[PDB]
Amino acid sequence: TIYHAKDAVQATKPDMRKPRLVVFVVGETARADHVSFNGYERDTFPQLAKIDGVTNFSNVTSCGTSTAYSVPCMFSYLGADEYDVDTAKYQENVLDTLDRLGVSILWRDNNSDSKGVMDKLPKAQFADYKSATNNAICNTNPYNECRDVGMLVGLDDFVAANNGKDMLIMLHQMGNHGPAYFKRYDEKFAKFTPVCEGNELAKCEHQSLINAYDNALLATDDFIAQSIQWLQTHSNAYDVSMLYVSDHGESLGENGVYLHGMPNAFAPKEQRSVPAFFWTDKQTGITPMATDTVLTHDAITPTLLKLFDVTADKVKDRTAFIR
Numbered sequence: 001t002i003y004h005a006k007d008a009v010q011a012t013k014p015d016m017r018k019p020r021l022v023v024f025v026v027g028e029t030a031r032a033d034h035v036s037f038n039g040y041e042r043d044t045f046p047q048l049a050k051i052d053g054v055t056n057f058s059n060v061t062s063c064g065t066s067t068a069y070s071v072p073c074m075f076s077y078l079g080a081d082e083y084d085v086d087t088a089k090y091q092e093n094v095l096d097t098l099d100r101l102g103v104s105i106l107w108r109d110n111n112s113d114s115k116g117v118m119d120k121l122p123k124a125q126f127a128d129y130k131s132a133t134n135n136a137i138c139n140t141n142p143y144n145e146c147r148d149v150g151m152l153v154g155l156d157d158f159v160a161a162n163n164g165k166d167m168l169i170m171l172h173q174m175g176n177h178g179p180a181y182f183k184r185y186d187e188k189f190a191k192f193t194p195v196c197e198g199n200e201l202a203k204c205e206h207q208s209l210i211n212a213y214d215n216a217l218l219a220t221d222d223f224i225a226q227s228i229q230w231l232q233t234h235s236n237a238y239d240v241s242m243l244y245v246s247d248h249g250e251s252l253g254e255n256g257v258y259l260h261g262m263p264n265a266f267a268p269k270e271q272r273s274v275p276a277f278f279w280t281d282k283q284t285g286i287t288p289m290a291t292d293t294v295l296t297h298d299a300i301t302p303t304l305l306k307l308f309d310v311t312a313d314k315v316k317d318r319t320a321f322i323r
């Protein structure tokens with residue numbers, strides 16, 4: 001384990017001030033330019049656009065173009081230009097730091113796994129929500145595919161077990177994972193029709209590919225709104241906040257390019273331009289940066305540290321999503 005933040009200190013402690021409860025939704029394949037708030041032609045986030053206090057960041061660039069590359073970089077201390085995906089698993093990451101300082105760390109995953117991020121922490125702090133053994137919401141669609149909203153169920157059980165402590169909950173979304181976008185949402189989010197239902201994205205009509213993708217976004221809009229709503233049921237006892245950032249974008253046929261995973265050296269902009277949302281309760285006194293701040297995945301680690309009143313020398317001058 002190569003550390004980077006053993007100097008990290010928490011200015012105030014939850015026994016001397018209000019405990020802090022953050023959900024960080026780790027998004028999947030969402031494109032910034034298909035977000036209504038960024039100028040997209042379709043209302044893809046109707047539920048999010050109804051909650052006061054949400055900041056939308058119009059200029060966010062992912063560290064890479066793949067789950068395996070981007071997710072470890074999102075929690076890393078090295079920044080995108082020094083980040084080594086092949087060595088990230090044995091570096092201290094920001095969750096390692098917050099757990100060491102006493103923040104309770106929970107990672108629920110409806111995507112795949114934490115891509116090595118959670119490996120140094122006890123395995124019980126990680127839960128697979130792709131399976132009905134944990135996820136109570138799988139029988140709502142013809143595929144019995146378990147749904148992101150199921151990761152909210154039972155979070156009150158977790159809060160009760162951690163009563164009074166600071167908490168950070170990562171919800172790793174299935175989100176817009178392809179190529180089967182049509183499987184990613186229940187029928188209530190099938191607003192754009194017809195939809196593409198094949199694994200060979202090229203054979204599909206372009207409009208039908210886009211409709212499947214946008215429908216999948218409607219389900220993600222619902223999930224994030226339900227996540228904020230769950231947080232508001234604890235705003236009395238906790239300073240609650242919600243960070244969402246997508247791991248990367250997606251190509252939808254631009255220049256005949258589909259899916260993602262292309263190397264940064266020639267990857268198109270659609271694969272790196274990602275949505276980010278921040279919400280906080282007004283009582284917390286957290287102030288977002290300007291909506292048009294130039295931002296990258298490098299902003300995540302300083303954000304999470306600021307949210308828990310932690311300082312560390314390695315990211316002390318890095319720009320965050322919050323002041």
Ligand SMILES: [Au+]
Nearest residue numbers: 029066067247
């Ligand atoms: Au991904």
